[PDB]
Design a protein around this ligand. Structure first.
Ligand code: CLA
Ligand code: CLA
Ligand code: CLA
Ligand code: CLA
Ligand code: CLA
Ligand code: CLA
Ligand code: CLA
Ligand code: CLA
Ligand code: CLA
Ligand SMILES: CCCCCCCCCCCCO[C@H]1O[C@H](CO)[C@@H](O[C@H]2O[C@H](CO)[C@@H](O)[C@H](O)[C@H]2O)[C@H](O)[C@H]1O
Lengths: 95, 166, 165
């Protein structure tokens, strides 16, 4: 009865919305701004917050869900393998 | 420093609606007393129309009507904060515009006015109460009884009854 | 009684003068889709025979392979809430007067800002039919929002049934 993988499908809906930006612009962590060392005064008591930056991939990587989540979930994860299996490998459809 | 009264609009209008509905209420009774025989609660239904269908129910009747009474009543509201009812004979009475020697405030006792031809909401004063207190009377004495006056044989003399409940 | 006369500006008015009811225009066209759904009945004595996706017999075309999850519901559903985020993206990028970027300074002289971007523009007749529809959807649509296990079979008596379980 239960779509169990209805929702694990579902939650790595969102944290692939996490595979994000390790890649695309510049470094890590929008480079450590303020973490260690302690932004004065402004880390002081405060900042930043911005009701204005919920875009960027709203549209692109909202596909990330349907990735693994399609053909790699209920439709038997990567059937197109072979790539060194003898100390064993396989790997074999429990499905 | 607002010494005393006040009020006005108020519950002088409060009354007349008691007065004139206690008056009607007793038209209720009026019926079963001359060519007599038929009433009390009689939990009417209430006069009942044709032999073409109801049938114990056909509907909550009673319940509805007064959805209607309802926005007609917002209407009298829809008057008394800000004076609006053409005739204008309750809010102070008619005789168009006037009485409101108490509409802008400053009363104390203010008697009032209102019939063009002629006289007043006055000896419709005291039919005003006769009936409110009458009901008081009317559904006072049920809770044990339900009928008036024969002759001098053996009725009007109160013979033997049975406490309040107890 | 929420519209019992109350509301100032960006919250009060601003949220609603067309905006929310212009978004409540969708409500009506949803209830144009839904009152394009209920009219399965609407026309009695009609020609029907059959369909139309009823009580689950076997979906669209079964697929050459075990249907993805199971049921017609999840496959038609999952898509709907991504291919329609198309519109609200466009509907949530506007402003009412002239459009440039986040420009210099434009608050108020005369002409007074504007009016819901898409105001009444007159035709105060959309609203007269709007709340008319809203009052319906919310209202005696609860004639069919309680215990409607049955359908249409009126048999002469009266009308109404007071209250009861
Ligand atoms: C309900 C409906 C509504 C909205 C009101 C509202 C009101 N009634 Mg009212 N009333 C109603 C039905 C209603 N009445 C009925 C069915 C009767 C009988 C009365 C007998 C009545 C009296 C005697 C008075 C009011 C009064 C009032 C006002 C206080 C208020 C405006 C008072 C003013 C007072 O005069 N009502
Ligand atoms: C403006 C109205 C006022 C007036 C003038 C009347 C007048 C009447 N009511 Mg009545 N009534 C009223 C307010 C009023 N009512 C109110 C407020 C209520 C609710 C309590 C009732 C509840 C009521 C009931 C239950 C009945 C009446 C009945 C009657 C009639 C006597 C019955 C009959 O057959 O006529 C006699 C006619 C001849 C020609 C003699 C009489 C016409 C009775 C009736 O039979 O139907 C109206 C009876 O059914 N009334
Ligand atoms: C011109 C018309 C007609 C007349 C003679 C009245 C008269 C009345 N209405 Mg009213 N009303 C009308 C049309 C009318 N209405 C219409 C078309 C609507 C549709 C919304 C209403 C909705 C309405 C409501 C919700 C209420 C009244 C109320 C009232 C009564 C109190 C006065 C008031 O609230 O003014 C309002 C005074 C103002 C200064 C308005 C403020 C204007 C904005 C810009 C601030 C009064 C007897 C009240 C009442 O009697 O409550 C029990 C109240 O309930 N009316
Ligand atoms: C103008 C009003 C005055 C006031 C403020 C009241 C108020 C009340 N009367 Mg009442 N009454 C009055 C004059 C008044 N009466 C007059 C003049 C008469 C005859 C002319 C009656 C005949 C009467 C009866 C038959 C009954 C009431 C009842 C009631 C009560 C109904 C609510 C309740 O459950 O009682 C809570 C009870 C009390 C607060 C105890 C006080 C006992 C008296 C006031 C009643 C309420 C306290 C009813 C009731 O159930 O009361 C027990 C009902 O029995 N009255
Ligand atoms: C999810 C999807 C997304 C991303 C949004 C997003 C948004 N909706 Mg929305 N909406 C959706 C499905 C969605 N809606 C559905 C299925 C209905 C029915 C609505 C009915 C609706 C209304 C009435 C409104 C929004 C509004 C909004 C915006 C606030 C925001 C952009 C508001 C703008 C408001 O107008 N939506
Ligand atoms: C989708 C939508 C659409 C386009 C239709 C379309 C149709 N429905 Mg229908 N229907 C819908 C939703 C919809 N329905 C829903 C949600 C229900 C519940 C029904 C219950 C229903 C019934 C009982 C009937 C139809 C019928 C019909 C047909 C006349 C027509 C093809 C009729 C065939 C038949 O009268 N529908
Ligand atoms: C997408 C739409 C298109 C369409 C189909 C319409 C259709 C209409 N417009 Mg309209 N309008 C449009 C774009 C459109 N407009 C645009 C882009 C503008 C601004 C450039 C306007 C500014 C406008 C005005 C000022 C008016 C109309 C009015 C009208 C209505 C008159 C219809 C008629 O002659 O029959 C009958 C009509 C339904 C008139 C009206 O009175 O509607 C309330 C009038 O007010 N339009
Ligand atoms: C949210 C709603 C509320 C509102 C605003 C209404 C409004 C209305 N109902 Mg109604 N109704 C309601 C809840 C409500 N009802 C409920 C809970 C029931 C029980 C199912 C009914 C059962 C009912 C019946 C039988 C009738 C109405 C009718 C009506 C209309 C009165 C006739 C008329 O319009 O005269 C001028 C037009 C009116 C549009 C009348 C109707 O629609 O036509 C006969 C009809 O009398 N209602
Ligand atoms: C004072 C008035 C009038 C009366 C007499 C009642 C009476 C009643 N209401 Mg009610 N109600 C009313 C006005 C009234 N309501 C109004 C104006 C509203 C809002 C507009 C409601 C909203 C309401 C709700 C939500 C409920 C009631 C319920 C009830 C009761 C269950 C009745 C029963 O057991 O049937 C059996 C009959 C007998 C035993 C006959 C002897 C009941 C005693 C309850 C109900 O409907 O029952 C599930 C429910 O709690 N009413
Ligand atoms: C509406 C606001 C709330 C009300 C509470 C405040 C009440 C006002 C207080 C009164 C203020 C002081 O008023 C004060 O002056 C009066 C005359 O100038 C004095 O009054 C006195 O002198 C008069 C001279 O012939 C005599 O006739 C008076 O009988 C005598 O009382 C009192 O000392 C006092 O009454």
């Amino acid at each position: 009865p239960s779509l169990v993988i209805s929702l694990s499908t579902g939650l790595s809906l969102f944290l692939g919305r996490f595979v994000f930006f390790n890649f695309q612009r510049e470094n890590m962590a929008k480079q450590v701004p303020e973490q260690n060392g302690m932004s004065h005064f402004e880390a002081g008591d405060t900042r930043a917050k911005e009701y204005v930056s919920l875009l960027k991939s709203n549209d692109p990587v909202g596909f990330n869900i349907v990735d693994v989540l399609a053909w790699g979930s209920i439709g038997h994860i990567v059937a197109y393998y072979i790539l060194a299996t003898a100390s064993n490998g396989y790997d074999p459809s429990f499905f | 420093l607002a010494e005393d009264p006040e009020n006005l609009r108020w519950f002088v209008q409060a009354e007349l609606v008691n007065g004139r509905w206690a008056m009607l209420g007793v038209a209720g009774m009026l019926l079963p007393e001359v060519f007599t025989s038929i009433g009390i609660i009689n939990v009417p239904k209430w006069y009942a129309a044709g032999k073409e269908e109801y049938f114990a129910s056909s509907s909550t009747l009673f319940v509805i009507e007064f959805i209607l009474s309802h926005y007609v009543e917002i209407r009298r509201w829809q008057d008394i904060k800000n004076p609006g009812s053409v005739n204008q004979d309750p809010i102070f009475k008619q005789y168009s515009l006037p009485a409101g020697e108490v509409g802008y405030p400053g009363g104390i006792f203010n008697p009032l006015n209102f019939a063009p031809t002629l006289e007043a909401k006055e000896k419709e004063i005291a039919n005003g109460r006769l009936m409110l207190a009458f009901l008081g009377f009317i559904i006072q004495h049920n809770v044990t009884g339900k009928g008036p006056f024969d002759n001098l044989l053996q009725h009007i003399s109160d013979p033997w009854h049975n406490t309040i409940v107890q | 009684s929420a519209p019992g006369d109350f509301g100032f500006d960006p919250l009060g008015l601003g949220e609603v003068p067309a905006n929310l009811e212009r978004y409540k225009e969708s409500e009506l066209i949803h209830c144009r889709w839904a009152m394009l759904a209920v009219p399965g009945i609407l026309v009695p004595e009609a020609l029907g025979y059959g369909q139309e996706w009823a009580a689950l017999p076997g979906g669209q075309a079964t697929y050459l392979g075990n249907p993805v999850p199971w049921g017609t519901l999840p496959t038609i559903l999952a898509i709907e809430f991504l291919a329609i985020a198309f519109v609200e993206h466009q509907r949530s990028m506007e402003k009412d007067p002239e459009k440039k970027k986040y420009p210099g300074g434009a608050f108020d002289p005369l002409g007074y800002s504007k009016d819901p971007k898409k105001l009444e523009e007159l035709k105060v007749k959309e609203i007269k039919n709007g709340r008319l529809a809203l009052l319906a959807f919310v209202g005696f649509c609860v004639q069919q929002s309680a215990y409607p296990g049955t359908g249409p079979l009126e048999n002469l008596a009266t009308h109404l049934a007071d209250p009861w379980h």
